[PDB]
Structure 1
Amino acid sequence: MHEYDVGKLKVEHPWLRAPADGEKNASFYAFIHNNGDTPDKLVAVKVEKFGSAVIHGDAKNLALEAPVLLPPKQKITLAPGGAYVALLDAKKHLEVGWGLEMTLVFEKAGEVVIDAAIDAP
């Protein structure tokens, strides 16, 4: 539904803000809960409808490409103004009612396919 389980991780309410007018980039957001006793990392994102996905997981330096670190028994927020995944080069114009299929790749927990909900206004 709006939450996806992989290993002892939970990806909750994945969503993205659609490209603004004249822009071709989108931003992907989610809440990732690590309910396990070992750390993990979001290391890659695969998406067919965009050219590529770049993880910006260091909130203190968002210009840098960096994985999202997922300490044990902690949750991490990807949200506007903080850590997020940049979705570059949309193949088509995004409409809200559409969802966006993505694959999140975690170093330890492996891959999980999600359907991200779209914010366009």
Structure 2
Amino acid sequence: HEYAVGKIKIEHPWLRAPLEGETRAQLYMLVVNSADRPDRLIGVKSADFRSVQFHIAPHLVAREDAIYLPPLSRVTMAPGGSHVELVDISKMNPVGWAAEMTLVFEKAGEVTIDAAVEAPDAMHA
């Protein structure tokens, strides 16, 4: 599933469902900036959770609340690598469903995605 707005593409967003009793989960998506100018992912809007923390290379233990995207760049995400932490989850659809959220890019604007809800220990897709 690809989403696109402006020169931004978001490929195959998916998340690990939170473990029973837990309120955090990891989300993974390929973000591509095909513009000759930088962009910034500055917000993730959802009624499902309070906030997000981006963990991106280099220094994956450090977090940030936006992602600066250089021109002609991408962020690849997977378990053990770059990822988004969804923080203070109040509700999440079942495994096999999707979670609706809106991404806000400073230049490209807003796109609503449906991130696939995968098993809590899923490694792909």
TM over 0.5: yes
Q: Indicate if the aligned counterparts of 1:45 and 1:53 stay in contact, CA closer than 8 A.
A: yes
2:4 paired residue number? 5
Q: Indicate if the aligned counterparts of 1:47 and 1:53 stay in contact, CA closer than 8 A.
A: no
* Structure 1 spans left out of the alignment, 5+ residues: none
% identical equivalent positions: 53
RMSD: 1.8
- Superposed, 1:1-40 pairs within 5 Å as 2-40=1-39
Aligned CA distance change for structure 1 residues 59 and 25 (closer, same or farther; 3 Å): farther
1:58 Cα shift? 4.7
Mapped to 1, the partners of 2:92 and 2:39 lie a distance apart of 34
Q: How many matched pairs?
A: 120
TM-score by length of structure 2 reads: 0.83
2:117 paired residue number? 118
* Structure 2 spans left out of the alignment, 5+ residues: 121-125
1:66 Cα shift? 4.1
Matched residue type, 2:102:
T
1:98 paired residue number? 97
Instruction: Render the CA deviation track for 1:22-56: whole Å, top value 9, x for unaligned.
Output: 32111111001111111111121111112322333
